[PDB]
UniProtKB/Swiss-Prot annotation:
The modification Cysteine sulfenic acid (-SOH) is found at residue 214. The chain holds residues 2 to 281 of 435 of the full protein. It is found in: Endoplasmic reticulum membrane. It is a peripheral membrane protein. The lineage of its organism: Eukaryota, Metazoa, Chordata, Craniata, Vertebrata. Substrate binds at residues 180, 214-220, 261. This is Tyrosine-protein phosphatase non-receptor type 1. It comes from Homo sapiens (Human). GO terms for cellular component: cytoplasm; cytoplasmic side of endoplasmic reticulum membrane; cytosol; early endosome; endoplasmic reticulum; endosome lumen; glutamatergic synapse; mitochondrial crista. Interacts with EPHA3 (phosphorylated); dephosphorylates EPHA3 and may regulate its trafficking and function. Interacts with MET. Interacts with NCK1. Belongs to the protein-tyrosine phosphatase family. Non-receptor class 1 subfamily. The gene is PTPN1. It comes from the Eukaryota. The keyword Transferase does not apply.
Length: 280
């Protein structure tokens, strides 16, 4: 399998070199819109920007900009929007994006605070009686229910477009145990969480693309989509062992820069795909 590749890279201690080679081969595309002066406060990180060709546009004549990219995986028949954790001023944009893109799910892979610092705004309501109104984009958001498990929490949220009074239910899948440092010791919980997201319909073609984020929207998010896509391809191809994780990662990198941020995240993605395949 890719399991023998894995075992070899481990014995050779060559994760850093494999990872660096991926970084060297990764696509480079312009991000002019992201870099415009008026958009400075719409970006959390100066070095994490969406490419112009794949960026999500807000349906808004003023400023259509949000730090989010559409990753479209043609063979696997899967699409994902990856975005940064909303900033104090981009929560209205974030939910405007969810509304216009017709997403069913949001996948959140970070805690609001990690390492003692804020990694994103508290962009969803924590009590059902205290809804949130986003005045800039005319959206109301209400917590409908919350189910806290040991490794993840799922919330049902109701998003209302106040201009048309249309209402949609959004599922919020919140993975809450990714460690502040490093990667999880075992991919078991992360895989379980991925299957819970799939089971909900959120990744399915009847809906717009799922929105996936952590603080920057490339590291954990890359892992989530990379694992999902490779597992799907292994189920659909005549030869499952032809699925090449490095090649899928580079294809994803054509749509958003920097997906998988460390060699340990790369190793972890391999482990997740390998154990997930053994389960399917």
């Amino acid at each position: 399998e890719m399991e023998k590749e894995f075992e070899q890279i481990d014995k050779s201690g060559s994760w850093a070199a494999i990872y660096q080679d991926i970084r060297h081969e990764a696509s480079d595309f312009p991000c002019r819109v992201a870099k415009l002066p008026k958009n400075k406060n719409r970006n959390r990180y100066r070095d994490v920007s969406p490419f112009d060709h794949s960026r999500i546009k807000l349906h808004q004549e003023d400023n259509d900009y949000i730090n989010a990219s559409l990753i479209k995986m043609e063979e696997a028949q899967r699409s994902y929007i990856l975005t940064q954790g909303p900033l104090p001023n981009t929560c209205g944009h974030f939910w405007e994006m969810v509304w216009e893109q017709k997403s069913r799910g949001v996948v959140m892979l970070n805690r609001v605070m990690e390492k003692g610092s804020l990694k994103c705004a508290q962009y969803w309501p924590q009590k059902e009686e205290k809804e949130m109104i986003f005045e800039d984009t005319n959206l109301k958001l209400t917590l409908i229910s919350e189910d806290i498990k040991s490794y993840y929490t799922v919330r049902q949220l109701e998003l209302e477009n106040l201009t048309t009074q249309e209402t949609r239910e959004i599922l919020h899948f919140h993975y809450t145990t990714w460690p502040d440092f490093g990667v999880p010791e075992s991919p078991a919980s992360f895989l379980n969480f991925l299957f819970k997201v799939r089971e909900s319909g959120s990744l399915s073609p009847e809906h717009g693309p799922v929105v996936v984020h952590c603080s920057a929207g490339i590291g954990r998010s890359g892992t989530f989509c990379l694992a999902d896509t490779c597992l799907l391809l292994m189920d659909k191809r005549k030869d499952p062992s032809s699925v090449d994780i490095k090649k899928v990662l580079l294809e994803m990198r054509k749509f958003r820069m920097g997906l998988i941020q460390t060699a340990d995240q790369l190793r972890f993605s391999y482990l997740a795909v390998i154990e997930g395949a053994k389960f399917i």
